[PDB]
Amino acid sequence: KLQITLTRSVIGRPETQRKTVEALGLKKTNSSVVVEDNPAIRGQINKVKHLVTVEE
Amino acid sequence: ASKKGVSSTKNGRDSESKRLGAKRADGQFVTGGSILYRQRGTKIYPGENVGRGGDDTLFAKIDGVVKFERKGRDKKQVSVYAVA
Amino acid sequence: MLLPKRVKYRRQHRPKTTGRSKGGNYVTFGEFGLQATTTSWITSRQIESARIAMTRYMKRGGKVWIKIFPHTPYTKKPLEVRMGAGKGAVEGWIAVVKPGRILFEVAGVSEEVAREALRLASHKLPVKTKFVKREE
Amino acid sequence: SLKSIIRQGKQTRSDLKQLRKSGKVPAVVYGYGTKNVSVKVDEVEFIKVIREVGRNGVIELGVGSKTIKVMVADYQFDPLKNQITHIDFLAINM
RNA sequence: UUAUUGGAGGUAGAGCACUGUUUGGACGAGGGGCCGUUACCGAAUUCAGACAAACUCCGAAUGCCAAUUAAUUUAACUUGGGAGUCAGAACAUGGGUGAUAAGGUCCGUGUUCGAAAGGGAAACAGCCCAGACCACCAGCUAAGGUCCCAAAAUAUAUGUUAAGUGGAAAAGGAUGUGGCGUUGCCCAGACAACUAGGAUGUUGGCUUAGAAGCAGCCAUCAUUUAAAGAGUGCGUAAUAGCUCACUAGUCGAGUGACACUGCGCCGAAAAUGUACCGGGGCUAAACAUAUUACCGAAGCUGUGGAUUGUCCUUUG
RNA sequence: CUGGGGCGGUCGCCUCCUAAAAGGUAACGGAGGCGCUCAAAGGUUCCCUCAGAAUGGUUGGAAAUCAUUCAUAGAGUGUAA
RNA sequence: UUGGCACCUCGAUGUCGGCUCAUCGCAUCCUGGGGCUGUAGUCGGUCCCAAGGGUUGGGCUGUUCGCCCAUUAAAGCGGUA
RNA sequence: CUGGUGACUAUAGCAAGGAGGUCACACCUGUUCCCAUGCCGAACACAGAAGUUAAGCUCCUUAGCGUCGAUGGUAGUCGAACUUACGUUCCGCUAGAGUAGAACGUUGCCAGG
Ligand SMILES: [K+]
Ligand SMILES: [Mg+2]
Ligand SMILES: [Mg+2]
Ligand SMILES: [Mg+2]
Ligand SMILES: [Mg+2]
Ligand SMILES: [Mg+2]
Ligand SMILES: [Mg+2]
Ligand SMILES: [Mg+2]
Ligand SMILES: [Mg+2]
Ligand SMILES: [Mg+2]
Ligand SMILES: [Mg+2]
Ligand SMILES: [Mg+2]
Ligand SMILES: [Mg+2]
Numbered sequence: 001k002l003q004i005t006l007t008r009s010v011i012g013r014p015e016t017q018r019k020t021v022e023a024l025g026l027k028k029t030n031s032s033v034v035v036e037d038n039p040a041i042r043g044q045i046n047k048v049k050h051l052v053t054v055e056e
Numbered sequence: 057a058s059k060k061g062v063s064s065t066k067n068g069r070d071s072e073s074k075r076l077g078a079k080r081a082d083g084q085f086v087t088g089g090s091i092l093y094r095q096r097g098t099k100i101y102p103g104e105n106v107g108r109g110g111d112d113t114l115f116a117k118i119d120g121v122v123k124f125e126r127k128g129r130d131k132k133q134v135s136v137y138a139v140a
Numbered sequence: 141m142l143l144p145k146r147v148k149y150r151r152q153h154r155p156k157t158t159g160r161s162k163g164g165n166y167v168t169f170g171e172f173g174l175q176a177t178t179t180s181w182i183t184s185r186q187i188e189s190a191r192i193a194m195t196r197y198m199k200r201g202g203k204v205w206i207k208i209f210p211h212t213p214y215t216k217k218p219l220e221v222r223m224g225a226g227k228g229a230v231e232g233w234i235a236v237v238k239p240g241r242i243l244f245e246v247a248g249v250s251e252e253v254a255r256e257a258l259r260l261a262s263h264k265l266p267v268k269t270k271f272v273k274r275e276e
Numbered sequence: 277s278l279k280s281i282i283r284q285g286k287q288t289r290s291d292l293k294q295l296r297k298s299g300k301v302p303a304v305v306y307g308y309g310t311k312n313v314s315v316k317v318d319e320v321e322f323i324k325v326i327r328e329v330g331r332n333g334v335i336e337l338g339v340g341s342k343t344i345k346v347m348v349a350d351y352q353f354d355p356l357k358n359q360i361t362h363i364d365f366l367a368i369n370m
Numbered sequence: 371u372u373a374u375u376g377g378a379g380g381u382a383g384a385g386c387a388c389u390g391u392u393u394g395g396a397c398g399a400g401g402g403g404c405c406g407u408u409a410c411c412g413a414a415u416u417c418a419g420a421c422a423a424a425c426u427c428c429g430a431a432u433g434c435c436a437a438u439u440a441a442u443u444u445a446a447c448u449u450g451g452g453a454g455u456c457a458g459a460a461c462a463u464g465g466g467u468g469a470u471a472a473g474g475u476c477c478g479u480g481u482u483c484g485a486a487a488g489g490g491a492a493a494c495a496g497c498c499c500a501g502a503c504c505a506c507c508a509g510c511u512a513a514g515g516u517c518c519c520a521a522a523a524u525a526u527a528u529g530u531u532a533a534g535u536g537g538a539a540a541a542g543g544a545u546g547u548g549g550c551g552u553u554g555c556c557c558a559g560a561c562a563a564c565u566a567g568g569a570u571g572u573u574g575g576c577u578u579a580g581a582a583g584c585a586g587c588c589a590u591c592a593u594u595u596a597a598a599g600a601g602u603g604c605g606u607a608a609u610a611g612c613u614c615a616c617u618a619g620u621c622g623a624g625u626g627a628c629a630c631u632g633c634g635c636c637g638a639a640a641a642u643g644u645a646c647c648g649g650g651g652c653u654a655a656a657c658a659u660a661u662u663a664c665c666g667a668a669g670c671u672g673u674g675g676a677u678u679g680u681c682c683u684u685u686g
Numbered sequence: 687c688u689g690g691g692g693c694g695g696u697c698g699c700c701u702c703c704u705a706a707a708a709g710g711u712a713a714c715g716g717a718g719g720c721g722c723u724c725a726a727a728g729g730u731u732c733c734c735u736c737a738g739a740a741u742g743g744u745u746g747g748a749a750a751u752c753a754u755u756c757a758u759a760g761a762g763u764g765u766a767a
Numbered sequence: 768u769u770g771g772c773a774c775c776u777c778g779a780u781g782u783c784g785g786c787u788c789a790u791c792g793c794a795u796c797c798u799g800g801g802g803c804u805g806u807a808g809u810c811g812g813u814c815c816c817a818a819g820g821g822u823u824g825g826g827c828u829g830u831u832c833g834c835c836c837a838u839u840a841a842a843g844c845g846g847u848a
Numbered sequence: 849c850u851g852g853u854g855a856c857u858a859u860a861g862c863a864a865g866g867a868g869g870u871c872a873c874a875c876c877u878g879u880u881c882c883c884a885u886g887c888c889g890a891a892c893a894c895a896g897a898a899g900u901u902a903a904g905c906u907c908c909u910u911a912g913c914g915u916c917g918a919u920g921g922u923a924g925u926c927g928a929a930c931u932u933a934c935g936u937u938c939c940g941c942u943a944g945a946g947u948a949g950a951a952c953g954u955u956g957c958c959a960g961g
Contacts, residue, residue, distance in 0.1 A: 007512095008499090008500095008512080009499075009500055009501080009512085009669075011481090011482090012482070012498085012499085012500085013480095014479095014480060014481075015480085015481095016371085017927095019443095020371050020372075021371090022371075022444080023371035023442060023444085024371080024442065024443075025442065028669085028670080029500080029501095029512095029669055030669080030670045030671085031670090033442090035442070036441080036442090038373080038440090038441060038442095039372085039374080040371090040373045041372075041441065041442065042372085042373085043371090043372040043441095044371060044373090044441090044442070046372090046927090046940090047371080047372070047927080048371095049927090049928085050927080050929085057770085058220065058770070059222075059770095060218070060220050060222075060770090061693085061694075062221060062222065062224075062225040062694075062695090062714080063226060063694085063695085063714095064226065064695040064696080064714065065225065065226030065227075065695080065714060065715075066717090066718095067226070067714095067715070067717065068695095068713090068715080069699095069700090069701095069719090070700090070702085070703095071699070071700045071701060071702095072699085073710070075709060075710080077378070077379070077708060077709065078377080078378040078434095078435070078708070079435095080435080080436085081377060081436035082376055082377035082378075082435085082436070082437095083375090083376055083435095083437055084377095084435080085436095085437095093378085100378085121437095122377085122436090123377085124376085124377050126857065127857095128857065129857040129858080130857080132378095134378095139438095142392090144390095144391050144392075145391085145392095147390080147391065147422095148389085148391085148422090148424085148425095149422090149423080149424070149703095149716070149717075151715090151716055151717090152422085152424095153424095153465085153703095153704075153716085154470070155421095155422090156470095156934095157470065158470095158935085159383090159923090159934080162385095162420090162421095163385095163420065163421095164419070164420055165355050166355065166419095168394095168418070168419055169393085169395085169418085169419075175355065175356075177356065179934040180934085203394090205394060205419095206393070206394095207419080207420075208393095208420080208421095209391085209392050209393070209420070209421070211391055211392075211420095212421080212422085216469070217468070217469080219769090220770045220771080221770090221771085222770095222771070222772090223467075223468060223474075223475065223689050223713095223714095223771075224688085224689055224713075224714050224715090225688095225689095225694095225695085225714045226695095226714065226716090227467075227468095227716070228468090236421090238934075239356055239934090240355060240356050241420095263541090263542085266541085268541090272355070275353065275355070284920095288938085288939070288940095289938080289940095290938060290939085293937095302920075302921065303921090304919060304921075304947095306918090306919065306920080306947085306948055307948060307949095308948095311919095312918085312920070312948090313919095313920095314919080314920060320551085320552090349947060350947060352922065358629075358630085359630095361921075361922075362920075362921045362922075363920095363921090364919095364920075364921085364946095364947065364948085366947080366948070
């Protein structure tokens with residue numbers, strides 16, 4: 001289980017990164033999701049790691 | 057205000073681009089007749105169940121999966137194989 | 141005045157100047173060399189000025205090698221003309237120099253003479269330079 | 277005609293940069309009687325050893341516990357910095 | 371969207387195998403002035419070293435097309451009713467053009483403005499943070515900040531700067547200062563200073579009107595030395611004269627060279643008024659590296675409220 | 687159309703580069719072609735392999751034709767790339 | 768200065784020269800203070816500090832400029848639509 | 849083992865040296881016959897078996913050329929942070945060249961031995 005929080009805004013970020021933020025299930029700034037850790041999730045996280053905070 | 061005479065360019069021509077290249081992916085299912093590859097000459101050769109049109113276009117002859125394959129050391133081909 | 145006897149294209153895109161020297165970064169013909177540390181176009185006129193300065197100081201005793209060559213033509217528009225209406229005419233020839241390239245080499249003289257000659261040469265050039273020896 | 281090195285792991289660009297800043301040279305030992313080994317040496321000590329033994333001299337390289345007789349197969353050099361950047365050691369057969 | 375797998379393709383880099391460009395050698399199939407041998411060797415070959423948008427023996431990162439494909443997500447497509455739009459801008463980045471000019475111009479990629487209020491950037495569409503449903507004299511944060519203007523550190527530790535550098539600029543110039551290295555000489559007395567010497571063949575030879583250490587060319591050798599250049603500068607028309615190198619002595623502890631780096635200095639002249647920190651002011655209230663706090667938005671959270679959806683579900 | 691307009695140049699089609707390794711992509715950016723040709727220079731069957739160089743050989747020379755060897759594409763592919 | 772660009776103004780931002788009135792900058796023409804000089808003196812050359820004040824009437828030409836006459840310690844160079 | 853006929857990016861090739869023949873493969877002997885030469889029985893075609901391993905062909909040796917080729921490092925670069933510096937930093941991916949080294953092929957089917 002991973003707690004993922006959108007800590008920086010998507011404003012001013014590329015549309016591809018915004019699409020990844022949406023695909024992670026994050027909605028508003030400081031919103032959070034709890035997801036099962038796996039390579040696909042880790043790849044999404046890695047793509048947007050400058051925008052999110054991850055807690056195990 | 058002072059204005060100098062200008063020359064002309066003898067250039068400024070180009071033909072329409074021909075949208076060449078791959079039209080279907082390796083591993084993709086295609087129906088018979090689907091164009092696989094647009095080209096000048098044989099940059100890629102017709103393989104199994106693939107024909108070569110009068111202008112070198114590569115096309116499938118059967119329904120099946122496209123496969124781009126090595127042909128010898130320097131060449132390559134594209135084939136279509138029927139799915140089970 | 142160096143320039144190619146001919147080229148296939150007289151009107152060329154100006155060369156990239158970012159990055160480091162692709163090659164010619166070592167003294168390979170003489171004993172001493174002048175190594176560029178900054179980036180610039182180097183013109184045939186600048187090459188000729190530096191060559192004359194260093195050879196005149198060396199007083200024909202030693203041998204000089206020009207390691208760079210101005211392959212690239214650059215154009216310039218005629219005076220006081222507006223934008224457009226084709227590319228301008230060839231104005232000169234330049235060699236692109238990036239940090240590390242050896243511009244000149246010298247042999248057959250003492251290290252002190254080589255240093256003074258290459259100092260005189262460097263003051264003619266639009267790049268910062270440093271005196272270099274053969275490495276081993 | 278001897279010098280000691282230290283084994284490396286898997287190193288990032290920053291790791292290599294910090295090595296070279298500290299004053300050590302990355303290198304690889306390969307050749308007869310040995311597997312490839314990624315090593316660090318000290319640049320000043322390597323320069324001293326090369327001055328002593330010559331360009332083609334044989335060096336006794338301390339690789340962990342073992343000692344290998346090697347020759348400098350090649351080296352990469354940074355002439356703007358006047359810094360040896362990398363070394364290849366060829367363990368010669370006897 | 372990501373993961374994995376397959377594939378198309380020739381860019382960045384690199385390279386010189388092709389097409390062109392190009393620098394030094396070596397050698398010359400063969401003929402000429404030359405008798406065999408001292409041009410051209412234009413050829414070819416060969417070694418080493420370079421250049422390319424329209425070169426390529428090579429060749430990425432990405433992006434792209436797919437998959438009886440997995441995870442997360444919420445779209446997607448078809449048909450029909452109604453539109454508006456067809457002047458775009460800055461910024462960043464890949465390029466052409468221009469002059470590696472323009473707040474220039476034209477394409478690629480992204481963001482923002484347009485059509486976006488709020489906080490920062492003095493003021494400042496396009497930059498940085500961030501997307502305002504409404505109310506609150508509640509809380510946490512972002513960028514950016516915390517001496518006063520003006521909310522919050524005259525915070526903690528270790529250094530650098532002396533230039534108000536910070537708070538505009540270059541080639542180049544400089545015993546500014548800090549750090550990290552290498553190295554020469556030295557109590558068998560170093561560096562500097564002071565005392566003394568600094569001589570002989572000889573006015574070396576040539577050249578010149580003259581050229582005697584000291585216009586310029588060729589050399590740059592010998593004798594006594596405790597050492598002294600066929601001479602480091604000044605001087606003469608040339609000499610003369612002064613001086614240095616070098617050596618011995620006095621003195622007594624450090625002294626010189628080089629490489630790489632941090633921060634500063636000069637180079638630096640415009641017009642209404644200080645006027646190139648927003649002001650006052652600052653020697654830290656500057657800069658670098660760490661650490662702990664706090665301030666800071668219409669972002670988020672708390673409380674109440676409106677509207678519209680979704681789901682439990684009469685109720686709410 | 688047009689880095690104001692006039693004047694100059696250009697207007698359709700093909701190839702390359704710019705074009706940022708899919709495709710596409712602008713400027714009065716950099717280069718060239720086209721408005722045909724062939725009755726075989728088309729179809730098919732069978733067969734064949736170049737350019738160039740060296741060495742010999744008469745008229746014949748640096749290059750005509752003949753012979754051997756070397757020669758992997760430097761030839762040819764009607765016509766630009 | 769000559770231009771390049773086309774960002775304000777085309778429901779108007781009057782355009783050269785002169786006159787009147789100036790004002791500012793200093794990259795200084797004179798006057799003041801200096802260094803070097805291939806500065807004997809008298810003169811000069813060149814550079815540094817310095818913007819307080821001063822810095823002329825005429826001939827020609829619409830002219831600005833420029834040439835010329837005659838002076839002056841000097842007859843400065845620029846910005847202010 | 850020999851041959852025929854396939855597959856595989858030359859690790860398979862080239863070059864040099866060496867060995868082989870009643871089987872078989874060739875060279876080889878001929879031009880009556882089918883067939884053939886812009887001339888040529890050279891070739892193609894056919895008939896044949898006196899001679900030869902000389903050449904082809906097969907096999908063996910090698911590392912001179914060609915081919916293949918790491919690891920390590922470097923260039924470049926996706927993303928991020930800082931920046932206008934012909935930039936810096938961090939992370940991932942990661943060449944080309946070169947080096948060590950590999951390599952004088954590996955195999956399927958069929959008929960003979
Ligand atoms: K210079
Ligand atoms: Mg390149
Ligand atoms: Mg854009
Ligand atoms: Mg509008
Ligand atoms: Mg707080
Ligand atoms: Mg306060
Ligand atoms: Mg809100
Ligand atoms: Mg214009
Ligand atoms: Mg493309
Ligand atoms: Mg415009
Ligand atoms: Mg009005
Ligand atoms: Mg002044
Ligand atoms: Mg004054």
